[PDB]
Amino acid sequence: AALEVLFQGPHMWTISKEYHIDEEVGFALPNPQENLPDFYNDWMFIAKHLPDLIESGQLRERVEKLNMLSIDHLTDHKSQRLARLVLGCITMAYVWGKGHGDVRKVLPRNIAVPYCQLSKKLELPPILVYADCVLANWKKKDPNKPLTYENMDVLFSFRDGDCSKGFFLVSLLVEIAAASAIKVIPTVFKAMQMQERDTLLKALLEIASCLEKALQVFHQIHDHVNPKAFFSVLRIYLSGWKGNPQLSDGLVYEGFWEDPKEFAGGSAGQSSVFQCFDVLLGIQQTAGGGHAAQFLQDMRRYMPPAHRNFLCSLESNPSVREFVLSKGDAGLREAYDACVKALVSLRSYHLQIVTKYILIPASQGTDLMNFLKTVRSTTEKSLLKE
Amino acid sequence: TISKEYHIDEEVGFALPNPQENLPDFYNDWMFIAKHLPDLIESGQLRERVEKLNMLSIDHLTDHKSQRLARLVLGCITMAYVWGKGHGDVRKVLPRNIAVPYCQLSKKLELPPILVYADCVLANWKKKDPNKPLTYENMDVLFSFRDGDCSKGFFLVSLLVEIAAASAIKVIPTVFKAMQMQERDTLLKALLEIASCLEKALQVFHQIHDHVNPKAFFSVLRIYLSGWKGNPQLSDGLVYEGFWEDPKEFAGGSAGQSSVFQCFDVLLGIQQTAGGGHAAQFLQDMRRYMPPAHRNFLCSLESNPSVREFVLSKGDAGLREAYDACVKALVSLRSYHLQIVTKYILIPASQGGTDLMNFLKTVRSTTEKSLLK
């Protein structure tokens, strides 16, 4: 598909398998690997027992006692993705410890070298990203039952009662519900090129319907996450080392790079499905010199390369918004607005979630709300009719 | 062959072919100011002429070439207005009569409202004789800032190197088709031709010494090409009166905005934008300052399989040697350019550009580390 895009121009008449978008789970990693080869048992033991090793003060010693394991026995993408999740969770636990302020600024070579090597191979930074902790950190309990919260579990957690299962899985379920609108993207671009007004209108309504369905999926957050544990426990382990006063220069990846490196912590700003619909609908979240725009643009380098490629390819295609704005067609404008309105409804509900889980507990924050309010505002201002 | 939707010309590559030299008569007030910047600046009459302008509508710029020329005109006027005589007395508000059509035209071309490489280098040129080839002797720039500023030498030598490197672009489809069809001999020959084009571009670079002098470049030209992003002289940015309420920050024109140099780093798997470092962040940010079709071309190149990974996986010395000849040619360009920056920035600053050298040395080292052997 890439070869033909060079010759015929950027036209997304189909979703090429090279973008690694699954029909069922979208940007999520389909059926993630749960076990590494026996050679990596020492990594797996630490990753699977982070809550106990952290609480007992034995984690840093277990990490320091590791031998440097070669990454050559991780032969496929899924084992490399699991290894990235394993090493990333271990790195977070090692750096932050019990989460009370005693930090480690040097990641031992026995973990830092295979971590950075594997990160270079997957073109991802050596820090836990949304693609690790949400997109690859899951399993079905029963392979014969559908993708529901009851039939799912996470592979790794940080502390007991940290609500990592609820937080990661509800993000994953919303991510998967929104992904059902991705298969409609080629229909939208083909309808525009072939000037098929009724096909375009029906496609825009189907995308709006998928995004509306994703809002219902979001409601489950309240049943599986509690504000105290999320704010005081989970939030500490998901911090990065970029502009972080606790690690002002970054982290030393011993044996791999000489100087400490700064990397931003895992963020849902790294979700490709939400950036995908903002690009598709011409909600220029990444335009201008604003902080919100710069953050979302920077988060693309923290997405898997095929997903980052998908986003810039969406950007290279003609504008759906410009097409709809030029047609003097109420029905088409209304269908476009139903997609934008569904995104505004998701972001408005999400702002209420952030008030419950971050704002109120912090008072017993405002920079996070201002970012979210800017993204939401840019979305609301994209509506053709109020 | 590469799609016409990418707007890569067969002869001048990413440069704008035969740029428009005159705007419609309606825009005579803009053109008079832009064509007389050296005199209006020196005499202290420029800011008054800009303040005396009526707000002209951009609707009479009907094609891409007239919109590109208008962007060059407004951008040069904006730089002269902001920096004045280049002695430190700055303007922090761009008057609405220029700021509004500038921002509107910039939104239309999907470019920020500041002079970019695509304005001042890619569209700021003409042939003296249309029947003679693209040589320095047969070329001139459309706009300069001050007399003796060496803008002709600096802009044209950049343009000539940009055009020489562009001859390797037509080989890109051959490289990707050869990889997909598993045509080893075709791929080897393609890599050797790209190395040959990059070697030729180094010779073109040597001309800089004949047309630019360190004193005038450092003390005069450098001042007019500054932007307002992290600039202590305009710490909050520039007010684009009538268009945005708050001041906005935009980086100044940079060769980090050249699409042809970013293209060969993407093609050869030199991950200049990877790693979280400042150099990577800068080159990534500069893509939003390129014309959208050229930014789309870079995305498309990035979406194709890695040439480096393909060559590394074949256990083929001849193919590795051809790939290494491309990387070596890029290292040689960057090493020569570092010596130029020592002559034109480092030494004049001492009679201080160390951050600029560190950025260039990071880019060069990332290129050197891509050699297979």
Ligand code: HEM
């Ligand atoms: C406990 C509940 C949640 C909290 C406290 C929360 C918090 C946040 C915060 C603080 C940000 C700002 C960026 C950052 O700091 O990294 C953010 C962004 C975002 N969140 Fe959540 N979130 C929650 C649930 C979810 C769920 C279930 C999803 C669905 C996948 C989601 C999707 C997003 C997206 C896509 C963004 C990027 C900004 C936007 O596109 O509007 N969040 N979230």
Ligand code: HEM
């Ligand atoms: C008077 C001579 C020159 C000086 C002093 C000079 C200076 C600089 C400086 C300071 C930078 C860093 C970026 C910035 O600050 O905007 C830079 C980058 C760059 N320059 Fe030049 N330059 C000269 C001639 C050229 C020429 C003739 C070309 C050819 C098109 C060129 C191509 C580049 C490229 C492609 C970059 C980006 C970094 C890289 O890819 O290695 N320069 N230059």
Ligand SMILES: O[C@H](C1=C(C2CCCC2)S[C@@H]2CNCN12)C1CCCCC1
């Ligand atoms: O943006 C971070 C986050 C995710 C992280 C979990 C681990 C990797 C991705 S999932 C989620 C859904 N909404 C926001 N998302 C943010 C970090 C700071 C605390 C609040 C959460």
Ligand SMILES: O[C@H](C1=C(C2CCCC2)S[C@@H]2CNCN12)C1CCCCC1
């Ligand atoms: O990076 C700037 C620059 C260019 C400018 C000219 C006008 C718009 C793009 S051309 C050139 C070639 N090499 C470096 N390039 C900037 C120029 C002023 C001095 C500091 C460096």
